[PDB]
Design a protein around this ligand. Structure first.
Ligand SMILES: CC(=O)N[C@@H](CCC[C@@H](NC(C)=O)C(=O)O)C(=O)N[C@H](C)C(=O)NO
Ligand SMILES: [Zn+2]
Length: 255
């Protein structure tokens, strides 16, 4: 199979006699195919930065092992040279500690696997706008990726209502350094939607929300380049192309 870096893939496996899906010694979780009773599904995601060239997954069955080969593709991402390699910046210690703290909290939430569907049918777009900056737009030095856009920016004047892309449980609902006023929703199966730079948060941690329910107001919080909604998807442990993901998910769970 082939997969563009920074994208997710839905692997289809036979259910009967299935034991384990493995990436070397890492376990990949599985969930029901919602239409085909004989199949299960796994989410496999490639990181945008420094992906392997090739992956081998092994589905272990009681009666057999099946190897899955995935070739990593570069895709057609927008990319710009910078002319300063200053990878080590010297923030104030207050900033350094807030970032490290918020990183630790995020890692703990994305670690808490929900082995159940919290969602309800297809993902909606969180507002009726258009993309102003694409997922995966890269900054390069040494023909190497130094940084990338890890979600997608929607056109939103300050105070635009933002609605939950799908049902789930709010796990983050506060002000963070890089994301500003942030909402993060667990949808189950390690799938998380992310709404950043909000001017107002209308949900609390641990709240069950419904698809199309108000989660806050768009803003420019934490945003140098002006007001927008930043929308992200974390799936299979990685930030992935969110409209590509929503499209692949919806093809499976719409009906
Ligand atoms: C690096 C990147 O392109 N986008 C994300 C980071 C991904 C979410 C994840 N990490 C943090 C720090 O929150 C989490 O821990 O939940 C961001 O915060 N702002 C970007 C610059 C933007 O482009 N705004 O428009
Ligand atoms: Zn963004």
């Amino acid at each position: 199979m082939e997969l563009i870096k920074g994208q997710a893939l839905f692997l289809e496996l036979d259910k009967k006699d299935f034991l384990s899906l493995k990436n070397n010694d890492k376990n990949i979780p599985t969930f029901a195919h919602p239409k085909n009773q004989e199949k299960i599904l796994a989410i496999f995601s490639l990181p945008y930065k420094n992906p392997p060239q090739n992956t081998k997954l092994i589905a272990f069955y009681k009666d057999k092992k099946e190897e899955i080969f995935i070739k990593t593709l570069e895709g057609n991402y927008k990319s710009e040279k910078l002319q300063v390699e200053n990878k080590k910046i010297f923030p104030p210690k207050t900033i350094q500690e807030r970032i490290a703290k918020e990183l630790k909290e995020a890692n703990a939430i994305y670690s808490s696997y929900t082995p159940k569907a919290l969602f309800n049918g297809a993902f909606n777009i969180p507002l009726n706008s258009f993309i102003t900056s694409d997922f995966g737009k890269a900054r390069t030095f040494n023909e190497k990726v130094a940084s990338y856009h890890s979600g997608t920016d929607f056109r939103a004047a300050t105070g635009t209502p933002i609605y939950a892309a799908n049902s789930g449980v709010v796990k983050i609902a506060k002000d963070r350094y890089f994301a500003g006023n942030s909402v993060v929703i667990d949808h189950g199966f390690g799938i998380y939607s992310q709404y950043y730079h909000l001017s107002k948060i209308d949900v609390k941690v641990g709240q069950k929300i419904k698809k199309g329910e108000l989660i806050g107001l768009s803003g420019a919080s934490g945003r140098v380049s002006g007001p927008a909604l930043h929308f992200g998807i974390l799936a299979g442990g990685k930030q992935v192309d969110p409209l590509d993901f929503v499209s692949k998910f919806n093809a499976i769970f719409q009906l």
